[PDB]
Amino acid sequence: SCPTHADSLNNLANIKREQGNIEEAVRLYRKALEVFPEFAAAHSNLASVLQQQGKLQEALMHYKEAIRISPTFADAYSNMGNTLKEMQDVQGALQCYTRAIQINPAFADAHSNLASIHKDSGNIPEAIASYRTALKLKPDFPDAYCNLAHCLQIVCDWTDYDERMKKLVSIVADQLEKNRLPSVHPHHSMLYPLSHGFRKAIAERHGNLCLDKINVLHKPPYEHPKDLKLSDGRLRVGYVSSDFGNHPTSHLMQSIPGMHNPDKFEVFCYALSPDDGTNFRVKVMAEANHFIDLSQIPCNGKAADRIHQDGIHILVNMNGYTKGARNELFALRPAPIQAMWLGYPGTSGALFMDYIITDQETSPAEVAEQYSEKLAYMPHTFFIGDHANMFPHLKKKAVIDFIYDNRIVLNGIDLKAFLDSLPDVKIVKMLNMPVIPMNTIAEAVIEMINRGQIQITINGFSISNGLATTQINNKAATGEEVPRTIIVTTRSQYGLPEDAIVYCNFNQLYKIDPSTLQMWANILKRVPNSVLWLLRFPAVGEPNIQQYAQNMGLPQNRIIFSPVAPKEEHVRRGQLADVCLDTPLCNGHTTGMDVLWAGTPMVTMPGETLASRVAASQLTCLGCLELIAKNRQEYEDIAVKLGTDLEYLKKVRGKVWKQRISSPLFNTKQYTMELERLYLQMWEHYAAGNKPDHMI
């Protein structure tokens, strides 16, 4: 039992760890702890390497031993807190982080970890403060700097934005050049001016973390099917998602599994998350051929075994590097063909994914180098929404003349019966828009809006206030049910001037960048009386956006903020705007479908990353190419023309209002059949004896 002998083995393991050989490091750390057990450093190092192998319980054990041996070991506290956070023990993580700060007030890593815990809980102001404290203790701290950079992005804090972006690029440059895990998350990387190669390298590295966690399983490669004989001529497709529930993913594709052709396909749905009781989860469980709750199988080795023995041919990754992802399942390759579909707007960077389902308008062959996987093109757009199914009451509308189409709006499944009950109704032809003229009925509706009342009854029909949806029917409010009443939606509800062009953007404020606010300021200045409609998403960003708005010459009233609303109210109130200004940095993907379903045109400026070219692809599939701008000048000009030429605004709004139903954008049955065609191409390729290659 020689401590110097164990010290030499410990340093030997540290070298082997720094050579990316986690298993040799493990062997030597345990070798050191067998020579001299009371070796606090060896316990913590073996804990760190076991933590990244995924053996959290064992890592926690060795962290406690190191802290027992030397209680002043603040580093073991913060790293034990990281282990507890990975175990969903946030309570214990806080105690570890705060006890480390108590023991060593100058220990920056504990402050940074405490900032991360606040960030994960939505406490962005407090996460910012703790990151700043950590950077004050340790100025060179890439994890603290990059995470703080994301927080400032979330709240639209653009102080020293240009210098920050350059520092982020250099940090990623260095970390990639030193074979270290980049401090920028791959999902965040599409917000900073990195090279496409930098982005792909970040994604590849975050995917190799999965390999480090599955290599400890020692699982042998699987035998994959080579035909459809056992499947009865059916192609077995497995959709893996942690978002079968009240998540935007289900809001886009919940009707897709039920629309597969049962003669050719067998649909497997693997939920990575437990049942949240929402109707989205109910619909997918009912309509899918099989539904497997992989959240009941934590072991990725066994969960991959379950997928393999189900006989999946094409396994679809709908998470990417997002919350709830379990891409270790895809790393064990239980299926012969593995593809990325919707949940992640980027490349996996890794080789356990073979394809990425996209379109030619979002992923052109020129930028086909930003994707590690091969490209699988869909006919028009890879993007789909379930708005035709979730919000059919928004299929037709009516207005009240106090003749705009977006000032006092009515929607309802039983609307046409109510309009026929009224004596005088004017039909503005275009299919057409009824107008309720000013009369005792209209007076009562406006009184209900003004008085703050929840609902009224007119000729026996239920007239509901658009702001009271959640107390009239909570599942109608969340989009789980179609409203059974008639809903009134006015500009006075949200403070929109009744005589103004209303530009809107209901995306999260993290997608706005200083240049985008500059373009919007230019557009608002050139269109007199126009307003910009944004959401408190988050609310702490509202003063920051307002501050930069004043700097660009816009007075206070030019930008109007409104609270975030339930899914149904959010989509319905998009009817009140005239034009939607999309965020060029990161396009509104689900928000883009939401605004287009309302019949509201959307000006976009496609970029180079997939995240920046989705809205353009949506507009191309819709059939509105005049809304797609090739540069900043054209983006501003298009929006100004829509805002100043009311006749042109009227024609384009009618164009969107009709092509939402006519174009394939919202036709889920078409999308599924084309998805099936692409699936069959991929299998024909593979069964012919071909490793994955581009599809068109």
Partner: peptide, 10 residues
Amino acid sequence: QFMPVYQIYL
């Protein structure tokens, strides 16, 4: 409470 941001007049 569902009051509007401003009110619509006669």
